[PDB]
Ligand binder design. Structure first.
Ligand SMILES: Nc1ncnc2c1ncn2[C@@H]1O[C@H](COP(=O)(O)OP(=O)(O)NP(=O)(O)O)[C@@H](O)[C@H]1O
Ligand SMILES: Nc1ncnc2c1ncn2[C@@H]1O[C@H](COP(=O)(O)OP(=O)(O)NP(=O)(O)O)[C@@H](O)[C@H]1O
Ligand SMILES: Cc1cn([C@H]2C[C@H](O)[C@@H](COP(=O)(O)O)O2)c(=O)[nH]c1=O
Ligand SMILES: Cc1cn([C@H]2C[C@H](O)[C@@H](COP(=O)(O)O)O2)c(=O)[nH]c1=O
Ligand SMILES: [Mg+2]
Ligand SMILES: [Mg+2]
Ligand SMILES: [Mg+2]
Lengths: 209, 209
């Protein structure tokens, strides 16, 4: 019985990391085998290049950094496929959607071009979008100093997420991320249990393919 | 008057590196501003990952290594564009074609998927293909121990090069690489002088785009 591939997506400060951590804790406590992953995975050689770019410690040509982001997912594919086939549900904080939305916020990068490198990745059984007004997210403290952490860029990424959400090939679910941490968590947990139960019924597919 | 972007392509031991070096020497001696580039460029952080992969000192997931190869070209684009606009002709040993042909020799990698990351690179004004029978190339000493340096893989790459050569969007020119070093060089030099003279007449375009 394979595990489910669950992705959380959303703009800066939407609550993705908090909710991913909580979701894995809850599934494990409910007797599910669940593990947490995140992208970018900053521990590999590629992830270190990405981390330095994000921390503004290095500048990286925009097409190159986009391909590094995708390569950072592809290096985890053999692990992702093996875990799911063993019955483990994987909760992923950001995936190929953040990859397209953020590079897509830069001038002159088509959505078609940004998707391609990620064409063929494991397709998620469930993609939660943690929806909240950029104004409310801005209240969640201040912006970090990482690249992309400013209002104008986030607004452009958000518009790109909105385009991606027209692909009905994916099981997208809107989550009202403006609620409390517990309330948001319960919404996400219920949706996740439903997805786990159906994932055991259909083979893992390929994204954008 | 911009410089020309000239690429040499071909299978293992076709003579690309020898002919690229000689071609730059000859153009410079003929009063042209010409410089030599190569891919992969193993000096950058990405290039070091590629070099270690090629030397079999590390294994890299096949989609990831493909995206690294393309990212390795994109990081040199700002330099490539600046040099050409200044009047410098760039002689490149391998480019996006080797990127598609070699990953395309692996099972289950479509040519369409391998091209995408490289869509939008500076399009070469001239792509020389150093044609020679794998049997004759095999006489040029023995295979190195780098990845891909075996008969079966080279035969598959060669077939992929043949597919790419059906894209009439590019100025492909076949070179009989089986001749002597000097004879091959003269063929390549003449073709290059012609390309330099016309490149000053049309803007640099975008590959596969
Ligand atoms: N439901 C919530 N209500 C209020 N504050 C929240 C809520 N969820 C998260 N926050 C807080 O706001 C900050 C952002 O939360 P977090 O889950 O880390 O965001 P994120 O979406 O992963 N951000 P990023 O990684 O920068 O895109 C943290 O300090 C959280 O405690
Ligand atoms: N025209 C030629 N006739 C005979 N031997 C040649 C010729 N050109 C190159 N070689 C020799 O064969 C070897 C391969 O040449 P080289 O130009 O380095 O190949 P290459 O195509 O760049 N190979 P690779 O980088 O491995 O794909 C070298 O030792 C060259 O001296
Ligand atoms: C996964 C991924 C994230 N990003 C961004 C979103 C964030 O700004 C940044 C760090 O992510 P975080 O907010 O989850 O820590 O990287 C891309 O630009 N491309 C990608 O492929
Ligand atoms: C430029 C490039 C080369 N290659 C290969 C061709 C050679 O096997 C190898 C090293 O190149 P070389 O023969 O020019 O030294 O890298 C790819 O697999 N992808 C690419 O994008
Ligand atoms: Mg986070
Ligand atoms: Mg060579
Ligand atoms: Mg296409």
């Amino acid at each position: 019985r394979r595990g489910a591939l669950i992705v959380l997506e959303g703009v800066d400060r939407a609550g993705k990391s908090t909710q991913s951590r909580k979701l894995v804790e809850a599934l494990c406590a409910a007797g599910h085998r669940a593990e947490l992953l995140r992208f970018p995975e900053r521990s590999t050689e590629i992830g270190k290049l990405l981390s330095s770019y994000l921390q503004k410690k290095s500048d990286v040509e925009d097409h190159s950094v986009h391909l590094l982001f995708s390569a950072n997912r592809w290096e985890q594919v053999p692990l992702i496929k093996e875990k799911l086939s063993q019955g483990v549900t994987l909760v992923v904080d950001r995936y190929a959607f953040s990859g397209v939305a953020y590079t897509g916020a830069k001038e002159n990068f088509s959505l078609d071009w940004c998707k391609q490198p990620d064409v063929g990745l494991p397709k998620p059984d469930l993609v939660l979008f943690l929806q909240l007004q950029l104004a409310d997210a801005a209240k969640r403290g201040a912006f970090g100093h990482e690249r992309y952490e400013n209002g104008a860029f986030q607004e452009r990424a958000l518009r790109c997420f909105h385009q991606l959400m027209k692909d009905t090939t994916l099981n997208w679910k809107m989550v009202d991320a403006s609620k409390s941490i517990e309330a948001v968590h319960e919404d996400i947990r219920v949706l996740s249990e439903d997805a786990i139960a159906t994932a055991t019924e259909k083979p893992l597919k390929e994204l954008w393919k």
